[PDB]
Assembly symmetry: D3
Homo-oligomer: 308 residues x 6
């Protein structure tokens, strides 16, 4: 199966030590961005994927290109923008809240925010089994929002990660635009959590949010944080619980789960063991700096499962 | 409110790996010293502070001056000793006792130890709301001890952290000299713990130690290690529990608590709320190498209290 | 004497290894920005300085403040911008050209670019012996350009580093705006080089460039890169050669020279000797990553001269 | 007392971050190999020891010699092979299984594997109080297996750590070769665990495995993983529980326990106390990268026990 | 144009500090091996290429695949070995000879040595414009040598880097196997040096070595180490001098020259200019640890030449 | 042949980046001190050596013991002082003077300074072929001075490195004390340089300084700094020139030369060859941090000489 994602790839600067950034002197570079992470989680389970994204005509842009190409992602439908730089962010870890991370963005007016419907080619989108994007892509600019509408219009099957970021838009704006997108397009997959349900449906309860969402989405993945996740489908509920592991950086974990779940679905996994495997990938993710560098293959997940 | 502390600022050489120093090859420099730590913690809560301290005419001494001045500490009452070197120490972490650190001093004949009553200006000391020192300052030299006596004679309100270091003086010396200071000068605040209570009073129980200490102090902070702290004030007793977090280096945690509690008292906090917030400060402290680098602002503490 | 400078403080991310950034994974943080660099170089010779700059209400903003305050720079006339982020930049070293570096900016719509006439206190500016800015400040925004005009309108004596950055503006607008400034305001000091001389006057010959510039500036420092610099004053020229040293990062060397040179002038140094000493400062600067970290005191320069 | 071990010394390259090696860029070097771990653990409790091993005529060879010599290990009966390299291995940490590690060997045809009967001096082996080897040594080559047979024939008292590596030989071969060894040579000490018992006897219950092994060994140490260990001696059994500590790398922990236990036995420690202390050594071991760097002295073990 | 190389891809472990490996504790991982380096230098000048190689079924094997795929090399003719490990090497730098490096191999019976004629597809080989191998491939095994003979029997145009490694065979066998190859297969390009000329022909002088080699090759590149390189073609000689730059690691530089030179020939560069450009690539190569990480594009080479 | 040195072993904290220590955050540990350095240099040329030194009962003390024992140094005549710390120092590199280093001591009242005649075993000293010390040991304390007097009284053949440290004693005391020692004890070897000659003799010219020193020493090694060294013996003079290498840290270089020269004299080397070889040892020394880690063997020197 082939996944096509639409969004902004970012270069990540991950603090080498925890604490406020004013006292961190070293930063470790990684390639990330939600849809880039989804792509890699998707191929790791043995499917194919491409990303529609625009990067700058700079080192960070070519870094993102080389990294994803090396991972086996189809990068041939990416664009290079000569008049705008690649977006970046910094990660401050475990401060002021232990176990949590904070993203600090330098993405405004980036090459990535300049993604437009003109970059969404019907001939390519038609080749996909699933077209995926996020609330991040909706939020970064109106051209990128337009690009999601275009791709979703073309798409037979649609996947959406809520991925709300209050640093990119108000909670009210986030509610309005997502409800707007869900109104226009019925989804095969909705990936969200209780934090975003609270913003969108004024509803923190996983069972209630999932019921309010069942009209827009066939299969709903409700992430609970460290506790794990619940999948809702065919009038069933299934809770897959998290694991206790050393937390280095949780950034990337929701995408690791999201991407792994979607890929196993297309490998014919039953819903519950797709989630069980997806939780393994997100568990491993929090253990490291880097959103992508220990996304597990199916065999690695199964090794974990034997011993854990 | 203005805090004035007297003590020895030290440069810290924190092992980059846990284990016996004989097999650690890399060390990370920080600026520390109990009274320097108290100042920054005090400042972080929106109050003002100065330190009366002597450093060497050397790179480490200017390091200490620049760092503190950068934190907004008043450094205009510091001295530079013409010939004695700035005091330093090394931290061996998690060995041979996990979750604990050991300080290895190179402070004998240091510029810090040459602090004397002649460095204590009377009108400066009158300008403070609270004057603070510790058992460390008493232990390093006769002149430093004298300096603390002079400051405490001039002070209207006095604070003292027992901070007993058996590497600097014997248990009897400590009991003697601390008891002598407390008999001479009633305290507004005593900051101590169980280990120092047993050495000074023979008494290990929090309540029994606190009752004895109330002959000398109005408000008693009885620290308990990872379990947290108890404040005793008036006829009340209040326990504030610690949090479970990954432990990097506990060095500094007691000052993080002490200094934060003190600052919040002068911001008008109830004793229990001031202790609660102070526990947050010392919790974040144990998570990092460096005694000062992740001292939180009041806002940071509240963020922690919400998302925790 | 007191220097006041106007410009944008930047946080620097300096590659830990040479080469194209797409293959560099580790980045080291420094506090930089031309006017910030001038400030520190000026105080290192024992004069006073302040900076009029705007930073963000973010970790990188308070980093800039703490660092500059620690260095003894007057920071009380800085502003904190509630909405825009602190400007940042990356350094790629020795690639594709050995011994050279290149700055990669993320400063568009930064807090620093939102410096305006409103941030320039008239009484504060009157307090300076020398008011200093550069071509970077002119180029970053209209309000920051406006701010320099205001400052220069009030100033008794003016200093200007041409500091042309062709990533910030075109050669023609650099030529036009610099000459517009020079014709409106006579300078006590002009700091430039043969590169910027080519752009502003078409003149690559340092003597002819100086002759052209002498209508606008009393004292002209014409830097020549590795080979040293020339001071033109009193109808005379003095050339001071550079030194051959291992080159880590040349970034900041120009500010090291200009700032040190200015400060020694006010210290009563004879003109040509003041340039000799400033060359030592720029020499030392190229030997490390960080624009400020090894700025020498007058005594350090003399140790260098004794031994070199 | 004197321990002589026979085995392959290995240079270890320890992944500086967790995750699959294809995305780890940094490796930290350590001297290891099971019998070298035993030697150092043994010397740390105040007895003497030597190793019979062969290393390459190469930097890694000389590294092992100098390190072991520095630790106080008799290295005079080691051999330098001119035609084969020192064997090495890489450690992949916490991936795919959290808290566990994986060794990736580059040891085939190594100098270590060329250990042979002729390298075993009768006189030297007779000077030992205890002659010790492992399943690793039987598995690496015939010559090394035959070397163990020769030394065990000459030895009065024998010690054996099963140390089964499925990467070195099959379960069936390991079962065959170990049972064959035990049938030929009565052991004073068998050091093993529940995994190796399952392979060798088809029995994973500690007590039943111990009873079955009692035909061949006089004192049986049954390691349980994180849970601790049980010692079987004189129809008696004694469980000594492990400690919960942050796990950096478990590699070496079983040798740290085994060597410390053996040495304290020869120091005249009561059996239960000898195991309590050996558990401290292995507890400390899992806390760092490096099999040998934080092996505790008896004194260090006692400090640990006072506090914990 | 399309290049096809045949040879062993190796994982490189690069000493982070100079000196004998026995006192170097940290190693930095890179992807290298001569033909792999040629491939990437070839792609950097805008041509296509692929590599015929086999890697182990291990992290280091998938690391090599991802890296090269990421760089744009065709990896579809690479194979995974069922049982043998990916070959690796360590680099000791600047000891005992300043500015020089030493490779220490763990490659015997590697996956890469098991490259064989049955892995070389005739139609793919025939599709290439140039087919290239080295003396390393000839040396590692007879299956690999067989594979080179096969590819060279099929190829219309051939290229060969002598790349003699005395750790892999004797001077005598190198002389014999290379002369045997040259007299069977006429080459379009011979890439070599004065060291290998001495071994193969007993002739160290470049002109006279080139004269003797002209019997087997149309275009001879005679590298000179730091001094640069001479190309001999069509009765002409052209010397292109090296540059003085700080040397971090010269490992990789000759491949960098070779691959860049070959690629620019197919871009229609005049021979002399191709060599000058090739020298820029090798010049930058020596400045970093990593054989591939700062291989320049043609554009980057032009930037170098413009300001140097 | 056996060298016995008497001195203070120090633990070295080497700055990981150049510049003023106030801005260096990372330090790298090495075992050092002049007589320790001589010992290892002596051993490296295949002779035997021991050291009489007192270290603390601390991690750094045991670090020193293990290191020197690992290098093959006889360590059995060292002492542990239970009441005083092992001495340490920091190295600040390339600031304020390029290519030079400075040592910042924390050695006052160290265990090494408590070296006393009591610690000099008469029997052991009589077993030496050469008993060596330096001006550092005369300067650290009066007991250590007396230790050198005792050992020199017992010895038949003596060696002395002037090694003047103006941070340890005044120019006049250094002159006075060294002339005292030279008058009391005829030296077989005097190792010095033109800086120390200027202080002791008022003479910085090599020939004139040697002429004056010839009344006191049989063989004089006059080090010149980077440009090399001269030997004076048997009415002969021989200058061996230095080499141009990249300089990391010159600390240790004079001891590398000293120790290597002495040891090669005892291998029966001509005086000129011994010096030549010694220069290579000191050339390599300046290229790394660490006084000891790249001391070459005779074979390493021969390789250097072959290529260089
Ligand atoms: N602190 C943690 N410890 C262990 N696992 C975690 C932790 N945080 C996240 N995870 C894993 O990652 C998954 C997704 O994390 P979550 O925060 O729910 O994602 P998102 O932020 O994208 O909604 C969780 O279901 C859990 O399996
Ligand atoms: N191991 C730990 N884990 C979590 N928090 C800790 C730990 N150790 C100390 N703290 C925090 O720091 C505070 C002070 O620690 P404590 O050891 O009492 O300081 P002191 O040594 O100066 O008495 C504690 O009350 C607690 O909030
Ligand atoms: N490669 C170098 N080697 C040695 N010194 C240098 C080098 N580059 C710059 N410098 C020193 O820095 C000073 C200013 O450098 P320059 O490049 O002219 O700055 P700017 O680019 O701001 O004009 C020079 O005059 C010289 O003393
Ligand atoms: N995850 C862990 N946490 C704490 N201690 C551990 C852990 N793993 C091992 N240990 C300690 O090391 C000892 C030996 O570990 P074990 O796995 O039994 O060794 P082996 O595999 O060689 O039999 C244990 O008994 C325990 O004390
Ligand atoms: N020390 C050095 N300094 C500068 N350039 C170098 C150095 N070593 C190699 N190079 C560059 O690399 C090219 C090839 O180096 P060389 O040693 O001839 O490679 P090989 O040994 O593989 O033939 C040289 O012609 C030169 O341009
Ligand atoms: N900057 C340098 N460059 C190259 N070699 C050096 C340098 N400094 C010292 N050396 C080498 O080390 C030797 C010892 O240096 P020297 O300064 O004479 O030591 P000391 O200060 O102990 O007398 C020199 O003779 C020279 O061979
Ligand atoms: O904006 C700039 O270019 C800048 O502010 O100049 C500074 C460098 O100045 P220099 O290139 O004149 O040495 C550096 O901090 C940089 O980012
Ligand atoms: O006490 C000393 O200065 C010392 O013992 O000299 C040693 C270096 O001296 P050198 O530079 O003459 O070799 C060094 O280790 C140092 O600390
Ligand atoms: Mg998410
Ligand atoms: Mg305390
Ligand atoms: Mg400039
Ligand atoms: Mg084991």
């Amino acid at each position: 199966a082939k996944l096509i994602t639409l969004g902004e790839i970012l270069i990540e600067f991950n603090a080498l030590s925890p604490g406020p950034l004013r006292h961190v002197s070293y930063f470790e570079k990684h390639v990330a961005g939600s849809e880039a992470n989804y792509c890699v989680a998707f191929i790791k389970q043995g499917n194919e994927c491409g990303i529609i994204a625009k990067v700058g005509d700079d080192e960070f842009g070519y870094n993102a290109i080389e990294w994803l190409r090396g991972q086996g992602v189809d990068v041939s439908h990416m664009k290079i923008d000569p008049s705008a730089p690649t977006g970046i962010f910094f990660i401050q870890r475990h401060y002021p809240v232990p176990l949590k991370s904070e993203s600090i963005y330098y993405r405004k007016g980036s090459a990535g925010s300049k993604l437009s419907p003109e970059d969404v080619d019907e001939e390519y989108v038609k080749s996909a089994d699933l077209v995926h994007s996020s609330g991040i892509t909706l939020a970064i600019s109106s051209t990128a929002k337009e690009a999601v509408y275009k791709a979703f219009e073309i798409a037979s099957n649609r996947s959406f990660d809520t991925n709300i970021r209050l640093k990119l838009w108000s909670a009210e704006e986030a509610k309005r635009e997502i409800l707007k997108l869900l109104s226009k397009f019925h989804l095969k997959f909705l990936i969200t959590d209780t934090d975003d349900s609270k913003i969108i449906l004024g509803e923190s309860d996983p069972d209630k949010a999932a019921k309010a969402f069942s009209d827009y989405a066939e299969i709903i993945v409700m992430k609970l944080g460290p506790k794990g996740a619940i999948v809702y489908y065919d009038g069933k509920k299934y809770y897959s619980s998290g694991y206790q592991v050393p937390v280095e950086d949780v950034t990337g974990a929701g995408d690791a789960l999201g991407g792994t779940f979607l890929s196993l679905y297309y490998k014919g996994f039953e819903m519950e063991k797709a989630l069980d495997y997806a939780i393994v990938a997100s568990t491993l993710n929090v253990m490291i700096r880097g959103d992508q560098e220990n996304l597990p293959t199916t065999k690695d997940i199964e090794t974990f499962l034997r011993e854990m």
